[PDB]
Amino acid sequence: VKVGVNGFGRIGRLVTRAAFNSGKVDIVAINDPFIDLHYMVYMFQYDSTHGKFNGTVKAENGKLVINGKAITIFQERDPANIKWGDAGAEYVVESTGVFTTMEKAGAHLKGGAKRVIISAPSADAPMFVMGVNHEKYNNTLKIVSNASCTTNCLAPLAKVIHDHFGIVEGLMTTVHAITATQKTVDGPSGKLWRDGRGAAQNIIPASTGAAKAVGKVIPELNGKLTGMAFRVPTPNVSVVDLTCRLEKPAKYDEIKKVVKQASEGPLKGILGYTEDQVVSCDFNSDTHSSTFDAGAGIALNDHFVKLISWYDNEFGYSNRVVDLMVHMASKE
Amino acid sequence: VKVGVNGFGRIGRLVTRAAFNSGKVDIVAINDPFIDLHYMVYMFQYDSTHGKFNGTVKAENGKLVINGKAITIFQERDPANIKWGDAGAEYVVESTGVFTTMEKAGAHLKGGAKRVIISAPSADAPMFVMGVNHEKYNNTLKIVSNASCTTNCLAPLAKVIHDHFGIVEGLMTTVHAITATQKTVDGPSGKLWRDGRGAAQNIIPASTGAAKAVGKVIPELNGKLTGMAFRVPTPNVSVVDLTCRLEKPAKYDEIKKVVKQASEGPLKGILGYTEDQVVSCDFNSDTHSSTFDAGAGIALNDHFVKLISWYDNEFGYSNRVVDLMVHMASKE
Amino acid sequence: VKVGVNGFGRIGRLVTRAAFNSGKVDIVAINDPFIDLHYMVYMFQYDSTHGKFNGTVKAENGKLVINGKAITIFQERDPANIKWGDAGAEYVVESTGVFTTMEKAGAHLKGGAKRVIISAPSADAPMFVMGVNHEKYNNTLKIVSNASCTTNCLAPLAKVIHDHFGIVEGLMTTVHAITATQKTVDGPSGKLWRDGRGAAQNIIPASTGAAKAVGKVIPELNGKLTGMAFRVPTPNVSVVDLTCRLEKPAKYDEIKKVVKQASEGPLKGILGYTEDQVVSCDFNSDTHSSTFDAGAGIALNDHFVKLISWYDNEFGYSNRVVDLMVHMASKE
Amino acid sequence: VKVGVNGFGRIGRLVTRAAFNSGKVDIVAINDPFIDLHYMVYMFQYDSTHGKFNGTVKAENGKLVINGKAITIFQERDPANIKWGDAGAEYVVESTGVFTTMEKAGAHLKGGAKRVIISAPSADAPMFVMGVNHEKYNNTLKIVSNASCTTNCLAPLAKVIHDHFGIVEGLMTTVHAITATQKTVDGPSGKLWRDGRGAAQNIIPASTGAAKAVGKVIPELNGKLTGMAFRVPTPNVSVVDLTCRLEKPAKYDEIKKVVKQASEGPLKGILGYTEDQVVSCDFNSDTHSSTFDAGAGIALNDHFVKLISWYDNEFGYSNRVVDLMVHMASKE
Numbered sequence A, B, C, D: 001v002k003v004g005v006n007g008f009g010r011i012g013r014l015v016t017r018a019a020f021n022s023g024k025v026d027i028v029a030i031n032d033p034f035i036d037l038h039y040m041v042y043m044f045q046y047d048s049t050h051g052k053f054n055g056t057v058k059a060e061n062g063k064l065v066i067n068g069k070a071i072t073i074f075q076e077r078d079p080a081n082i083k084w085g086d087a088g089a090e091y092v093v094e095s096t097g098v099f100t101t102m103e104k105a106g107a108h109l110k111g112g113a114k115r116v117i118i119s120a121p122s123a124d125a126p127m128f129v130m131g132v133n134h135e136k137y138n139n140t141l142k143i144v145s146n147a148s149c150t151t152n153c154l155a156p157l158a159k160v161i162h163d164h165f166g167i168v169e170g171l172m173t174t175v176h177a178i179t180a181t182q183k184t185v186d187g188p189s190g191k192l193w194r195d196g197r198g199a200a201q202n203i204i205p206a207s208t209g210a211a212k213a214v215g216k217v218i219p220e221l222n223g224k225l226t227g228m229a230f231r232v233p234t235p236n237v238s239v240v241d242l243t244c245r246l247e248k249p250a251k252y253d254e255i256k257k258v259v260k261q262a263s264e265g266p267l268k269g270i271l272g273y274t275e276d277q278v279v280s281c282d283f284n285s286d287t288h289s290s291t292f293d294a295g296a297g298i299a300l301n302d303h304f305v306k307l308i309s310w311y312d313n314e315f316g317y318s319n320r321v322v323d324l325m326v327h328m329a330s331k332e
Ligand SMILES: NC(=O)c1ccc[n+]([C@@H]2O[C@H](COP(=O)([O-])OP(=O)(O)OC[C@H]3O[C@@H](n4cnc5c(N)ncnc54)[C@H](O)[C@@H]3O)[C@@H](O)[C@H]2O)c1
Pocket: B006, B007, B008, B009, B010, B011, B012, B031, B032, B033, B034, B035, B076, B077, B078, B095, B096, B097, B098, B119, B120, B121, B147, B148, B149, B150, B179, B180, B181, B313, B314, B317, D187, D188
């Protein structure tokens, strides 16, 4: 399928990387009004976190050509004006973070796009997480959400656990890497005052709707989960810390077996499993949504356990945006 | 009380600094075979995390002289050889990290000290946390532990919540600043392999008995709490994240009211309370054991809640070592 | 003299702190459209780099009240509309970074300000560095510039060395702490593409006019100096590295004596001297413009030498802004 | 040539990585008394800076097996007791950092090694830098040094500039990533007090003989260069800042040409050249010795210039150790 990307930010660039590495979808257009063609060459070629792109990146005849694939570049502030149908962009990845409602994201449909995948949570577009509920997608849905990086880490683990032992209730913390929303030194962030404080100097508490959101993609968990976040001074890779009460008793070793089995089966490539003595850098550019860390977690008793799973918040998620698009395309 | 300090390290120097700031005890001797006298001046005078010493420090005739007060200096590798009695040191702060059993810490009694305070959890020495069980200290105890920074944070909050609502069970996470046992780049770390990984690059999961230890200072909570830690790239200030089940129902506002009331009363100076939009740097050089963060926590229902409390792992703990020694001296 | 601040940022806030230590400067008004009154209370009170404010700060009756002094708060995007005259602001500190020319900074005069001090280099306003050319100010100048942090570090040193030995030519590197113009993760940065790359992850080369600008405040050095910068992952405190050819011969010991003699006499408070084994954090909240590090520099021979001088880019500069106002006020 | 590695650390491990990209060097033995066999598997497989090993690693029958090649593991503190001859190690890489003189590194010969390559400057073993003086090696030299990362960055650039324009005199600064010698928080470093201060909190000045050593590899530059370093909070990748006086005049674009020409011909893969808007992370895992940053440097005039070159201090140098062994083996 032919894909257009709106917003060549971290997620837009890394979706693009993922699409080219993988060969699965064809990027044919990109819109970004704040980043010109020659700057796009540079921002895609060099990446502080994931390294230099492999292959050619160049500007040719007002296009962005990556390994000889020419991509049409737009610079529209208003998504309605973007000529997606003319450029052959069938599916649009909406990655600006500012067009996340059905209302706003549907503006791509005017331009000729057939479907829009919001690379972020939505107030009202239906949400999907690969391995958890992506089967609920159907042909009538033109605007969908891939949820958040954190919900994509948590939901597959919650699913495995709930399925075998039943989650009565659960409280989540994510210790999350620095994001573009943050500031280098104490500066203004109007509404969210903690998020203005110097990012590399602080542990910063933040609220997050990721845990509640799991209750939408796994409806049996509706109301059973919530949580919060701490932003910490790393550039990428984050971790979920799920403290849950279980209905059926489970020895920790039973939890390990059942997660490892899910990682080898229906959730392969989505949920991983490790017993190694890992740290966050070992998940740099790792494509899983969630990788359970058997050694880091801890049980108080057979009904009350803390479970730990890692996620490359940029790269895991980006690959899932690609995989959702592949599924949607198979269902046309 | 006249105090000797074994080990001039983060904690050894900050205990010294807290003693000089507060005036609560008199430091009369320091032993550290790896820092010569002129190096001691330098290490005490300049501090990256807490700033220059406010006062004077110099070497004079073989003594370290702080604020004009001369301190006898020893250079002994074996604590059994430290002539504490010649210096007049009555209590000895055992702050090396390598003599934490009663048998090992008891060597200070051979050179003339009367009591020893181990500035770390001990496998076997009686453990005390100011504001929680310090009143159980008595004059028969010559060798005691002030527990860990993390225990000193968790225990006062745990006491308040258990006292009011009953903790049925809890799991703790501590998001913890980097420590001197870590490494700058990936290198060897004995049996704790994760701990050798480059400290400033990684979120590093770690074991801690600090939650279990709360059952030593609050026996009713024996077997009801455990936890783990994550080491992240900040130089100082850590946070406890406690997920607990309560016996009685408690609305989040009643929880706040009761913590705030404990902070103003018998735990004043130990347990703090804030509703401000704080981040970790706001507690740098803060002397509390634990500061409840009202806006950071979240409740799922009236019996399942996540409570957040901050702690200056260096300077809050150092001040508690000083406070315990004042309390001990009041019982002689 | 009564002062207004436009732009309540790192420099706006730190100028306000510094001013609360002088009888000669009173802050009476502040304008910042991205920080409402209750937000200012918070941004002023809490500071990741310099710690909590030691006086009182409150919002009371629509005013910002600091150490009992009520400050009028404005919220204008266009400095032409700010009613400084009404609030009694005679001098205005122009610290937004976006009005650095005479035309733009001159807007403040429409509202009744008498003089404007731009807290950055200006293309056309006369530039002053305290201890170097501040006596060239006269009371007909309504718009002036306090130059940059880097210029304020380099000029006093350059002056001492030129005055004693003559500098034939010099090339400067500054290794500079992260700032507000940088980005947390790889992001859009207009024409300065290097400045967009994640600030915590990188050493980032950057151009700086600061060494050239020394040829304005020391006209004999005109065209004899230039330089560049590297941005590095520290939150505050920067260092100048001056490699210069000297006209007369100077042994390194003579350079030291000469610099120290200046630090004790005419440039006391502006130019410091140390022989201690210092590192950047040792200058955090340090009010000097420049402190020569005697142990860090190195000479190739008597005419070719690398000289090293530290500067708290936030607080040293913020104190010079106050000091230039005090000097200007003395000339009224 | 079959090679053994003494000290399996950043350089030991990355040499080993680089050896496994070379059909001309076979690692057959590793000694490291602080890393047992199973820990070596972990330490080799996972790398925070350079990512997971792209190959296989396991322990089998007492040996470390990398990409199917079995390597004998020794656990000796005293290098004279290591049985290199018996394991078949002809060359030994001496990468502990504690055996750098001819006499100390000589110890490997007693256990049957034929030649020793010291991965660090030596007081008396002959120093080589690939592309500058490696052709001065001959088979009578059983103990050699590959100089330092910083010398390998500066010397190739200095050669090009000196050969074309002549360097009358030069002063170097290197802005260098953190290394294993540093500390995570302020701690003891008795010979080098600045180096004990918390590494991720500070810019730390440090002495370096690397500029002076360029005079041993380029005897015509003897006494004409010296320099110093700052250590800053990045995990890897460093930069040289060369301030030099030229005999013949050279416009900056003539400098660019000569350097670029050198990079395409005889110093290819050693000296790189870029005009891109690069920052440190763009050289992470880059195998060059020195990459000239055209945009970053600046000239005062035709005879006085500041030149910028980047280097991955870990990975470039490690590749050079391997390249030096290849060269030496070519002469046997
Ligand atoms: N830093 C914290 O956040 C913190 C908090 C609570 C408790 N603690 C505990 O405090 C203790 C010390 O911690 P630290 O962070 O100060 O470590 P540190 O590494 O900074 O200090 C240890 C000091 O002991 C010295 N030393 C080593 N061997 C010695 C010997 N045989 N005799 C005398 N001195 C010796 C070293 O030279 C060093 O100055 C540990 O038990 C640790 O668990 C630390």
